[PDB]
Nucleic acid binder design. Structure first.
Lengths: 473, 251, 473, 251
DNA sequence: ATACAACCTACTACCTC
RNA sequence: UGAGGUAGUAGGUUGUAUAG
DNA sequence: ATACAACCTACTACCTC
RNA sequence: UGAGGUAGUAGGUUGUAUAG
């Protein structure tokens, strides 16, 4: 019998200075932090696909009800939740002719067809941004479903329908969002089945992406992403300690150049003067040679940490009093010495490793339900298991499907307090602005760093990428 | 207060000594230690094992003239506590040796009990044949059942670890057969079938099956053993490590 | 006694499909064409200067009354006129410290100080655009008044206050708007005397920029520029003939490179499918060697006209049926042959020269008032004088101060109809979106082409400039 | 119906012939034609003028032996209509010659009437001295007045043109003097004073002053003349060209 | 390179909407 | 450069014509 | 280059919010 | 890629140990 502590559910802040654990319930009742007068939407795609987006936006205009409101709260409509006018009138449409979208699609080479497909959309988006007087906050890009079948790695094109750049990723979304970074255009990619799906039917006749029970949460996530991309503050953390920068590092492979080059991307979160919460990318991607190193050299580690500390000072005025670096991978002594060299005397540096690999599963004695979320088995003052994925009563079930795997949190470097570290990671698991869910299974710094890395390993020709998340997520 | 059942089996006891026998020339280099009856790892010119010096006589007739005084046997309690560390062997690489020995012992013990084997990408899992059990239900929980034309079986994979405790972690898996004896060769088909079967396997459907399989592997009412050698046995508890949580809930 | 015809006052279109001659009266009663839910304003400048902008925006929030409402209609407030929320709450502030703004100001070299001053603002604007989640439609840049004294050509710095890049213009505004073109950020520059002026006083004590009688029109022009820059349609033309592209060319000098290089910039206006009015830049700046040529070589003329025709076809589908090229300068035969070579058989090309140099002044027999605006003396079927600046009863006076000079409109090339040409130039004099006035004294194609040229002769390192006017005006 | 008064003075008549006298060697090259009493332009080896052959005898004593038959006199009506065009002279450059002659004649005629002169950036303007007129008011409209310590004067500049009609365009200006006789040397001071004075000069303040100055330049009740030569005079109407508009308004 | 006429832009100053 | 208007400076080019 | 343990990412498939 | 979760494949690296 080993003791199993439980971290209290962190609370996020909403409009009027209110608090709630659930992001969906907080937004549905209290609203977002800032006031966006309206979202002017640009829609690029086939004229057939424009009808789908118009119908779906009209759908989300009205309140939406799902199968079980206790498990998944209903959607009260966009203008009621985010007090922002996102209408179907005033959208700027850029038609993509079916002939054009088919001419490049029917190609043997996946890389060339992906490059041409991405260009077909981004050229129109860039021209609309530059040489047009209309103002658009978010460019909603609708793609057909055969495209999704034949525009990504390992997509074998059928032989009967073959009719007819390699320095880029063979995936549509990553290259698409990588090539728009110079122009800073927030875009949202929609499959024609993600939008109105009842038309798309399989052999049995039921929709292949049958969302008959889950319209409410689909609309919730779509609306939250649209609000975030337009420059809105959905919610904020309320338990962030003063003088604490966080930073989170994720490594990715780059197949374009010989040797994966192991690009490292970081996401920085901290508190601002007053009460504002700062959460952005820290992107200077520091590429790592060797096939499987996944560690930073002293020069690049110094550059990364100096950039993060300077970004903190430029907004608060003094250096952070304590920094909690996260990473999926363990830190070795070389990069930690490099980090400590840049770090001043006052700042406390902590290196935390977060992984899902450890094969621990707690099955409860009786009852067809899994463990409560937030339970932590503190192995010792430097290592613990934390159940970020688990049961929470408000969502009426557990966030997983099978028995979840706990996060293994280890203070690889530094000293830190284990309970405080588990208290912050649980707080970090809340601020997922891409997904309007109760909580995330991984700390948001790691997830958004992974997204940044995925997008920036698609384009070789990037330079000084934006640090705002809306240009990636 | 709530009690939780983990998938970690406590390792109740270890042999008193971890032995490194100086087989040297008596051990041909062009020989794999996996065919040895008992677990053993070739470290330097030593053979690291928990077994006795002459337990490998059948596979190594040339070791009949080995001298027992050449062994550098180690007090395993020092290894697990961390006391032992020297130029000959390092505490980091001396505990990794025991994990390899325990893993190979688990594999050999599973081979001994005649449980069918399926290779994964990295690990190997041990499932039960259609008809091996009485109607295919050990204890009161079924382990092997039917789903359309596919006979599904519950399988487990073991991995010894020493970091939190000396424990044996067990991972649960579902496997499928076309006739109940031969395994489907399509990885995609097996993956889809496993997802379909696990769609409706909740907490007590996994926990009870795992505990039933462990109890099947049991040799007495409190544990089972992995055969280190002719005289040495590692006893692994059949009751998994239990955790006590101070907060719970109800439907 | 020579006959003097009069062109009817052209009518512009407003919301609900309404018509009115006066832009101010049309906006005050009928509103703008499109719906902007709100204008999110970014303000960069000194903290002292932020207070001035906040106070002035609060001022223009309420209805504003001027000295004589008959001559200059009163301002009914921003939200009442443009039905758009432009509040003082929600502005994104970027402080410029007085120490920083003084460190580079007190410099002997005008070019270096101008470059550093421009950089001090544009770096903050670019960083806010890229690495911040706030959304801003227009970046309102406030500059002090000593800066305006010591940041432009021929500004002799006083010796007692001297404390301490040449490839750029020595003027703050032109370089400022030239260096932001890559990022497509609409900005508005405000002197601290253009905003709240009652604090700025001369030796006598009266404000130096005393606007005690003209608050209404000051607010009118400021609000109209702010609405246009945010992506709004203030008004549109209603008398544009189908299949008619216009285009207007203006030449400017470039002192940066040896030989003025006579950069030529064009502004294209035409009608779109349905009823929309297209009015944007046509900017591929075609530089002209020789010190005073002011004529385009065959290659550059072909490039210009091919670009304009292709831009028309890409939006309507077929080539224009008639093109009316305007220019301050006369066309020679070489560039006109170059133009006609690109032009198809169906399209009719007309080359019109517009100048103010001709010393004609009609003084009326009796009465201390000048001639009516719109009077035209048709010299012959190819040349005429047209009074774009003159009396119009609705504004209660004449648009000029002394006796105005008429525009000399000559059909230099092509055939054209003189009365139709004078009917279109008078219509063109209406669509000045930078100034909320009754009408402009020069056709808008020439004026906005001149603005584009002025901005693009400041930066040598420009490439593919945007064609939208909000990035220049 | 409204009648408008322009600033264009009609050129009522021209001399019958535009003469090109073959002075050649009789005309020294190192001599400026501006010192000639009558307007003349050196075109090729010809002297283009409306004057008689021996009108330049005082400045050119060497032309006393000129032969009149060498003149290539042209029927000016053909020039203005456009009929005349050949290799010797082109209609574009033959009408430009007459404009130069008319401009120089206007300058010389202004010099003859003793009106003070002020040089602008490009043109020259003719203002009236303090005391030249009776109390400085010609007709019933004052031409020269006071403003603080600056004596302000009304000045005009002339420029002959042939495109719409053969006309003489007159531009109006305001000039300032410190004592009424000598001109202020500061361009900025003069510009500021001119703006201040013109701040309150409306339609009838400009029109009446322009017409009064023109009537002062008049020589009879219908026109004045520019002296082309000893016998030839160009008559410029003192009544400006009038335009008739079909639309008007009232206060 | 000088003179002219008929055409060109860049810049400063004041006044007014 | 919130704007538009009207001045006055400064320089330039083309077309001719005669001379270096 | 072979074996192990303890650590790593990239990709496809199904299920669920 | 509207999302999150759980699998199963595939490859890799480090640390040792003995051999080419």
């Amino acid at each position: 019998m080993k003791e199993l502590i439980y971290i209290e559910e962190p609370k996020i802040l909403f409009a009027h200075g209110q608090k709630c654990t659930d992001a969906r319930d907080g937004l549905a009742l209290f609203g977002p932090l800032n006031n966006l007068y309206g979202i002017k939407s640009g829609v690029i795609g086939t004229k057939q696909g424009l009808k789908i987006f118009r119908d779906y936006l009209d759908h989300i205009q009205k309140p939406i009800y799902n199968s079980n409101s206790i498990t998944r709260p209903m959607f009260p409509g966009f203008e009621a939740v985010f007090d922002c006018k996102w209408e179907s009138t005033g959208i700027t449409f850029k038609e993509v002719t079916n002939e054009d979208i088919g001419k490049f699609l029917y190609n043997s080479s996946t890389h060339k067809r992906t490059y041409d497909l991405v260009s077909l959309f981004i050229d129109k988006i860039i021209s609309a941004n530059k040489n047009e007087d209309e103002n658009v906050d978010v460019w909603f890009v609708i793609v057909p479903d055969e495209i999704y079948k034949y525009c990504r790695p390992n997509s074998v094109l059928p032989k009967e329908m073959v009719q007819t750049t390699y320095n880029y990723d063979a995936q549509f979304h990553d290259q698409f969002k990588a090539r728009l970074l110079k122009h800073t255009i927030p875009t949202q990619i929609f499959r024609e089945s993600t939008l109105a799906w009842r038309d798309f039917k399989n052999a049995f006749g039921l929709p292949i992406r049958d969302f008959s029970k889950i319209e409410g949460h689909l609309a919730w996530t779509i609306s939250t992403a649209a609000f975030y991309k337009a420059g809105g503050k959905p919610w904020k953390l309320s338990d962030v300690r003063n003088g604490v920068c966080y930073l989170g590092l994720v490594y990715k492979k780059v197949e374009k150049s010989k040797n994966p080059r192991n690009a490292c991307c970081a996401a920085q979160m901290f508190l601002d003067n007053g009460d504002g919460t700062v959460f952005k990318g820290e992107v200077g991607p520091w590429y790592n040679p060797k096939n499987g190193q996944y560690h930073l050299e002293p020069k690049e580690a110094k550059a990364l940490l100096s950039q993060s500390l300077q970004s903190y000072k430029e907004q608060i005025g003094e250096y952070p009093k304590e920094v909690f670096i996260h990473a999926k991978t363990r830190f070795n002594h070389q990069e930690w010495d490099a980090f400590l060299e840049v770090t001043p005397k006052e700042t406390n540096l902590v290196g935390v490793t977060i992984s899902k690999t450890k094969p621990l599963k707690l099955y409860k004695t009786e009852g067809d339900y899994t463990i409560l979320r937030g339970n932590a088995y503190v192995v010792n003052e430097r290592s613990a298991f934390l159940w970020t994925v688990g049961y929470v009563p408000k969502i009426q079930t557990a966030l997983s499907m099978e028995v979840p795997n706990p996060l293994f949190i280890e203070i690889n470097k530094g000293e830190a307090d284990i309970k405080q570290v588990l208290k912050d990671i649980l707080s970090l698991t809340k601020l997922n602005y891409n997904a309007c869910i109760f909580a995330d299974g991984e700390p948001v710094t790691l997830r958004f760093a992974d997204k940044i890395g995925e997008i920036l390993t698609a384009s070789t020709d990037i330079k000084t990428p934006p640090l705002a998340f809306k240009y990636y997520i | 207060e709530e009690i939780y059942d983990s998938n970690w089996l406590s390792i109740l006891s270890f042999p008193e000594e971890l032995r490194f026998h100086e087989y040297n020339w008596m051990l041909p280099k062009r020989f794999d230690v996996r065919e040895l009856t008992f677990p053993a790892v070739r470290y330097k010119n030593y053979l690291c094992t928990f077994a006795w010096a002459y337990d490998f006589t059948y596979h190594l007739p040339k070791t009949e003239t080995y001298h027992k005084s050449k062994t550098i046997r180690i007090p395993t309690e020092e290894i697990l506590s961390g006391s032992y560390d020297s130029n000959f062997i390092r505490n980091a690489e001396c505990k990794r040796l025991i994990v390899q020995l325990l893993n190979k012992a688990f594999e050999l013990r599973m081979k001994d009990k005649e449980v069918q084997e399926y290779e994964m990408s990295n690990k190997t899992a041990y499932w039960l044949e259609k008809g091996k059990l009485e109607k295919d239900k050990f204890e009161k929980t079924m382990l092997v059942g039917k789903q359309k034309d596919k006979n599904w079986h519950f399988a487990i994979s073991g991995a010894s670890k020493l970091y939190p405790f000396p424990v044996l972690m067990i991972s649960s898996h579902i496997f499928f057969t076309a006739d109940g004896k031969k395994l489907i060769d399509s990885s995609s088909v097996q993956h889809s079938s496993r997802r379909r079967q696990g769609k409706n396997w909740w907490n007590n459907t996994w926990r009870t099956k795992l505990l039933a399989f462990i109890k099947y592997l049991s040799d007495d009412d409190t544990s089972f053993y992995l055969e280190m050698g002719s005289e040495e046995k590692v006893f692994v508890s059949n009751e998994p490590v239990k955790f006590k949580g101070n907060v719970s809930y109800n439907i």
